[PDB]
């Protein structure tokens, strides 16, 4: 029967597809590792695929995956148990150390570029002729932390030019310096911007950017990681 041959053939195809798909999905993060960083004995039934090479635009180089894997940063954590499968506790300030939910990845220390090779993200003052087109303009608003104290004021919006979206708020602290607050992590209200993830005392601790007019991928990761980290690590003073 032809329908029998068809359905049998399909299941064989499907198992092959799943094999292809799972190995495609092992180009990052493998080989698996014991908790001390050594290659794990059991790698599962799927082998790593043959490497592929991405040619990055704007002379940024190439990426070959799979390839040799390393964090390229120190991790301030320690085993809580001799056997595998248990948590690793922060040995310092997890927020300052960038671990757990405050983690960040050693991304390129250059800014993402658009299709034409210009910085993707710019402060609105430097983005011609971008403006707030709808909703409450947050520039000028005081920024409140989860302790209900003012930590600063919004002085600009950092915009994704090719996607025409607000990505960060630039917030000026008491000392006159600024920090980027991720747009996904702030509540714009009519009289304030509220930030649930961080108490007022934690804004100074937000990682800073090297140049005032651009942000690198590494910087974004450090900033986003740090702010998200506050939901777990600032929970003491909130209470709101």
């Amino acid at each position: 029967d032809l329908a029998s041959l068809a359905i049998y053939s399909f299941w064989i195809f499907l198992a092959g597809l799943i094999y292809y798909l799972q190995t495609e999905n092992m180009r990052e993060g493998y080989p698996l590792e014991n908790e001390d960083g050594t290659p794990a004995a059991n790698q599962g039934p799927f082998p790593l695929p043959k490497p592929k090479t991405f040619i990055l635009p704007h002379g940024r180089g190439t990426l070959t995956v799979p390839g040799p894997e390393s964090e390229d940063r120190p991790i301030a954590l320690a085993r809580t148990a001799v056997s595998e499968g248990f948590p690793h506790a922060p040995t310092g300030d997890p927020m300052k150390d960038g671990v757990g939910p405050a983690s960040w990845v050693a991304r390129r220390d250059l800014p993402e570029l658009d299709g034409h090779g210009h910085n993707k993200i710019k402060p609105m003052k430097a983005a011609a002729g971008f403006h707030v087109s709808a909703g409450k303009n947050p520039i000028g608003l005081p920024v409140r932390g989860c302790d209900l104290e003012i930590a600063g004021k919004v002085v600009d919006i950092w915009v994704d030019i090719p996607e025409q979206m607000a990505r960060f708020l630039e917030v000026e602290l008491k000392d006159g310096s600024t920090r980027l607050l991720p747009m996904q992590m702030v509540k714009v209200q009519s009289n304030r911007v509220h930030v649930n993830a961080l108490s007022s005392d934690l804004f100074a601790g937000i990682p800073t950017i090297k140049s005032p007019t651009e942000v690198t991928l590494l910087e974004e990761d450090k900033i986003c990681g740090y702010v998200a980290g506050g939901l777990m690590y600032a929970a003491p003073k909130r209470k709101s």
Partner: protein, 302 residues
Amino acid sequence: AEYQNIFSQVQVRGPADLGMTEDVNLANRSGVGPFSTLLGWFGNAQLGPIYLGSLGVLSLFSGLMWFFTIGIWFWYQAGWNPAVFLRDLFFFSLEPPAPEYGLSFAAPLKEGGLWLIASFFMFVAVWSWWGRTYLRAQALGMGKHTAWAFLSAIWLWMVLGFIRPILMGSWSEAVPYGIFSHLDWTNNFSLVHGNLFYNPFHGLSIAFLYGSALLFAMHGATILAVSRFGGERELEQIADRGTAAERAALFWRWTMGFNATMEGIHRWAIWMAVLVTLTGGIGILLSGTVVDNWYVWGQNHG
């Protein structure tokens, strides 16, 4: 409360984005359309520009001709009364030739001939549209994944309207053009073939359709969950993995014991979706050509 990133809080706008050039013939591109603040709460506010060109003109003309061929038949069926047109809109139907006419193009105009004409226009509309998905990617130096995925949908469409009727030996097997009548046709198709629930390819098709909703809900929810780390910038996460991609991965690893990458999830996505119409088309194609009755076939396993 926390912000959920379903709707934007603040819209920003700049100069209209006229897009990448590459090998695109810029003369065939329109100007920008208007900006929709309403759309801007959810996705991009900008409309247009669109690429025209010769293939697109052909496609659009053809499509409109298909649509108007049906519509004129509806007007006829309504006796040119506009109130009757609106009342019975979903009840009108442009039907294929009766079985006695077989595959012949000599079916009378009002008994299948017009259906053939409408079908010819749809045929060229869709296939020229497919060429366009290919060419638009080509002019931009992009892969042809869109054209390949589109082929899976075209497969089911072709089977329903073209391949199966030809193998069955009459146009009468094809689907009529009507809102309610295409539904009646679907119901009847299952009834006549011994219940499509016994067609293993219909079952597969459903697994993948449900699976598509499962997977897009998963992927969509995941990306939004890590958008606080710029997770939706998927191409750059592919080129240079960030904590977004890592947390996305580990959510799933910890939940269900395995995970994707930022690139590979999009391979799961495209296959999950294309398998809907691939298995579907096969299921429909075997029905009546090889298997008269799926209940019966199931009792034999073959």
